[PDB]
Write a protein that binds this ligand. Structure first.
Ligand SMILES: Nc1ncnc2c1c(I)cn2[C@@H]1O[C@H](CO)[C@@H](O)[C@H]1O
Ligand SMILES: [Zn+2]
Ligand SMILES: [Zn+2]
Lengths: 300, 115
């Protein structure tokens, strides 16, 4: 294989360059399930493989790193994904998480509500989203670009992701947004990553690596999602938990990446090159301050 | 004043044969760690499982105030090592046992300080 010993599979570049039409997603191993190590939750395995993959990219990893995790809760009321992120991230990393539904978490701070209500004074070095509405999986209806939390995420990236920062946003066959794909063209590099433990699902993490704040490439998100589905439809991925058994190199290396505050007029080509290499973060280094808008209503 | 005694309730419930709190978040790790009880990253040794701390805290999981004037949680945001023999009930374990303030190991499950 080779592939089975990886944490998962990233979309091959040649698929990204196609001009496919959107088809239904029919996965060969649709019903298979990976055999997880004893007592390990699917979400722990999935986030572990995601982070193992992110370790191979040029992530900026500054001191006083700031990470926000959307969709972090679970029907069990805990946050397995946040627990993996906090294990992965350097000690002292500030980690905020959030979900529509209540849950208890190891994050430094948690906000409960619709993500559209969330505001932050500060910019972020990494944004993780597992938000998902299972009502989108409706094979009887056309598969159009979805708005809702994807609209929020696109604006949140453009307003609050530090230059040099990165994102991993969960999508599926039916949970996707064309503007989010278009925004992948504003990073030095991007992919769609499928975990090997969840390879029987149309889920992937859309990863934008090193944000540039402007388009490097003009991407048609409708076509690109069609390209992603075509890749999945024609490339069965063998379910695998092999990578979970080797955790010796798991922690993200604290690279001490430089943080500078700069005005837009100062972002020259040399800065852009540094940003594209994982060697610079541009943002204020002020305090992390968050809030959630609360709708007030009467019943009397 | 009246205050619910959540710890006694879980302990009595267990003795009565109630099923231990589940969905404690177990971590993947090398199992070559220090073996200390409560750490900033997973530190299970070969005889332990490491869990996300919040999910093993009775007060966190049951949405009740922490038994601390400050309301500060000992486990949230950290990782708790549970002997593999007791990992069916991480919440019961953390509740019924105590960490040595000198070596950081669980009293009776790693603490060798009275030797
Ligand atoms: N608009 C939102 N804002 C914040 N979180 C959201 C949503 C929606 I739609 C779904 N979710 C959360 O995503 C988790 C995975 O389904 C679930 O835990 C679910 O609660
Ligand atoms: Zn607690
Ligand atoms: Zn001791």
């Amino acid at each position: 294989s080779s592939q089975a010993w990886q944490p998962g599979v990233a979309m091959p570049n040649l698929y990204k360059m196609q001009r496919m039409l959107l088809e239904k997603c029919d996965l060969q191993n649709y019903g298979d399930s990976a055999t997880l190590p004893k007592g390990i939750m699917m979400n722990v395995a999935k986030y572990t493989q995601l982070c193992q993959y992110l370790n191979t990219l040029t992530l900026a990893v500054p001191y006083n790193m700031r990470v926000i995790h959307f969709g972090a809760g679970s029907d069990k009321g805990v946050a397995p994904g946040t627990a993996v992120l906090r294990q992965w991230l350097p000690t002292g990393t500030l980690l905020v998480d959030s979900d529509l539904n209540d849950f208890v978490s190891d994050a430094d701070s948690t906000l409960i509500g619709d993500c559209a209500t969330v505001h932050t004074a500060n910019k972020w070095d990494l944004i993780i989203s597992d938000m998902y509405d299972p009502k989108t999986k409706n094979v009887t209806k056309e598969n159009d670009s979805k708005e809702g939390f994807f609209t929020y995420i696109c604006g949140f990236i453009q307003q609050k992701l530090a230059l040099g920062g990165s994102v991993a946003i969960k999508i599926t066959e039916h949970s996707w947004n064309a503007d989010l794909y278009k925004l992948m063209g504003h990073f030095a590099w991007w992919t769609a990553f499928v975990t090997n433990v969840n390879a029987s699902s149309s889920e992937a993490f859309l990863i934008g690596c090193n944000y540039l704040g402007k388009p490097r490439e003009q991407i048609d998100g409708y076509v690109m999602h069609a390209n992603y589905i075509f890749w999945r439809n024609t490339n069965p991925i063998q379910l695998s938990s092999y990578s979970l058994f080797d955790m010796s190199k798991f922690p993200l290396k604290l690279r001490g990446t430089a943080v500078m505050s700069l005005k837009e007029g100062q972002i020259n080509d040399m800065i852009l090159s540094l940003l594209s290499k994982g060697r610079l973060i541009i943002r204020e280094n002020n305090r992390v301050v968050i809030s959630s808008d609360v709708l007030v209503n009467n019943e009397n | 004043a009246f205050a619910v005694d959540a710890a006694k309730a879980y302990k009595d419930y267990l003795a009565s044969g109630g099923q231990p709190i589940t969905n404690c978040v177990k971590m993947l790790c090398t199992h070559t760690g220090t073996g200390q009880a409560i750490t900033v990253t997973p530190e299970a040794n070969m005889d332990q499982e490491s869990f996300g701390g919040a999910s093993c805290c009775l007060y966190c999981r049951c949405h009740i105030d922490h038994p601390n004037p400050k309301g500060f949680c000992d486990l949230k945001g950290k990782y708790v090592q549970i002997p593999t023999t007791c990992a069916n009930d991480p919440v019961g374990f953390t509740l019924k046992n105590t960490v040595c303030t000198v070596c950081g190991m669980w009293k009776g499950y790693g603490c060798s300080c009275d030797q």
